[PDB]
């Protein structure tokens, strides 16, 4: 009944609907999208459901909506470095993170859950993915939507990683547990990691970190090449 994580974002229904309306306004090729149907499918995935019993099947009525064009070679994957990834695509408008697609744009920076017996949106608390349960509305949404975006990637797949982290590449992150395993070797030639020196000055070649060599090994067994670049100065990287 009570959960360890923050509750549903305030005015979540209006936010999801406005975002859909705004996204289909900016992208005229998407004006065929019924935003009422989008909100109804999103709402239907988690309302009246126990927020630790959520499955990929619950999101399929939403997953089918929002078809759009994202060139396979213009995908940008990221892990634990959300701000820099989104600033990059705001500059290089041809490239997309998942949160630049309709489904990702709807849910970016939001939290949501319901209660089993009632039609109420639980605004008090929502399950913490590490403390309460992994099969919660927010975690299941991202894991389900991400897999298809990773399956789409081709040629050189770029991933931005946070080099200031204890684990630059985390095997148990959405990228590490979902996206990496859905990259298709028949279509993907190389996975290129961009290790961001976000925080403190670190003159080290972070492309030699054990977690990077671990990522190289996982991607190698799936018959894909690996490339790594250090982004020593991220603030100057955006201007370049």
């Amino acid at each position: 009944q009570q959960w360890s994580g923050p509750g549903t974002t305030k005015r979540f229904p209006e936010t999801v609907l406005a975002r859909c309306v705004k996204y289909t306004e900016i992208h005229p090729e998407m004006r065929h999208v019924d935003c009422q149907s989008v909100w109804d499918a999103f709402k239907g995935a988690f309302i009246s459901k126990h927020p630790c019993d959520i499955t990929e099947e619950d999101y399929q009525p939403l997953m089918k909506l929002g078809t759009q064009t994202v060139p396979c070679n213009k995908i940008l994957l990221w892990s634990r470095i959300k701000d820099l990834a989104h600033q990059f695509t705001q500059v290089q408008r041809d490239m997309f993170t998942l949160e630049d697609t309709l489904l990702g744009y709807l849910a970016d920076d939001l939290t949501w859950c319901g209660e089993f017996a009632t039609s109420k949106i639980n605004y008090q608390s929502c399950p913490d993915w590490r403390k309460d349960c992994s099969n919660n509305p927010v975690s299941v949404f991202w894991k389900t939507v991400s897999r298809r975006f990773a399956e789409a990637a081709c040629d050189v797949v770029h991933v931005m990683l946070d080099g200031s982290r204890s684990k630059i590449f985390d095997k148990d992150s959405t990228f590490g547990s979902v996206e990496v395993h859905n990259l298709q070797p028949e279509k993907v030639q190389t996975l290129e990691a961009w290790v961001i020196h976000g925080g403190r000055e670190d003159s080290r070649d972070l492309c030699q970190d054990p977690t990077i060599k671990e990522l190289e090994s996982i991607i190698s067994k799936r018959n894909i090449q690996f490339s790594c670049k250090n982004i020593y100065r991220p603030d100057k990287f955006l201007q370049c």
Partner: antibody
């Protein structure tokens, strides 16, 4: 490697039914619309309808509503198209094709087609 | 249903020359039009989609343009392997209707 493998050629008497199959491999079956296209001998392509296997939602062009029924078997990663009350005009090659979700549902991978011949 | 009209059923060309095929939609389909190539006894193959997008590996001699109700597919330099039937399709709103096809044959 994405592949769509369709069932073999069918021959049917008028008024009977036929169920065609399309087995998908190399991608997450539930996450893409599967669409079907008819091609009468020597004629052009005609869009029949579609199914989203993740939730079973379907839709058909007016011409084929009441003629075609699409279903999906998630365990076998197979989409089926059932054609009822067969007539000579139903003789054609039927293709299944995947809608590219990040290609605005254009048809990226195609099956090899199933020939259906309806005759007495 | 939206009607897609390819006004030329057949076009004669020469190897190395450019060819353009036109398609007209009965209603606005924004930029969401695809072009498929089909050879005898083969399944159709997507060449262009969303009016002008081309999947990695599809030859750059194939281009698409257009928006609204008028679309064009061009082969900048016809190769022997390009003699086939070309179909436009709108993939904007279901039913995702096809044009009637245009067969490209060689002049002699």
């Amino acid at each position: 490697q994405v592949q769509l493998v369709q069932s073999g050629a069918e021959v049917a008497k008028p008024g009977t039914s036929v169920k065609l199959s399309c087995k998908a491999s190399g991608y997450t079956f539930t996450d893409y619309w599967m669409q079907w296209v008819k091609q009468r001998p020597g004629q052009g392509l005609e869009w029949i309808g579609t199914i989203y296997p993740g939730d079973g939602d379907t839709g058909y062009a007016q011409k084929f509503q009441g003629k075609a029924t699409l279903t999906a078997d998630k365990s076998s990663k197979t989409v089926y198209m059932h054609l009822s009350s067969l007539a000579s005009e139903d003789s054609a090659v039927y293709y299944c094709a995947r809608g590219d979700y990040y290609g605005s549902n254009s048809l990226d991978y195609w099956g090899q087609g199933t020939s259906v011949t309806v005759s007495s | 249903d939206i009607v897609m009209t390819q006004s030329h059923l057949s076009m004669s060309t020469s190897l190395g020359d450019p060819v353009s095929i036109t398609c007209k939609a009965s209603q606005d389909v924004s930029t969401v039009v695809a072009w498929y190539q089909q050879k005898p006894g083969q399944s159709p193959r997507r060449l262009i989609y969303s009016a002008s997008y081309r999947y990695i590996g599809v030859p750059d001699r194939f281009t698409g343009s257009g928006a609204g109700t008028d679309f064009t597919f061009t082969i900048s330099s016809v190769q022997a392997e390009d003699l086939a039937v070309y179909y436009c399709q709108q993939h904007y709103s279901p039913p995702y209707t096809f044009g009637g096809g245009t067969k490209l044959e060689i002049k002699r």
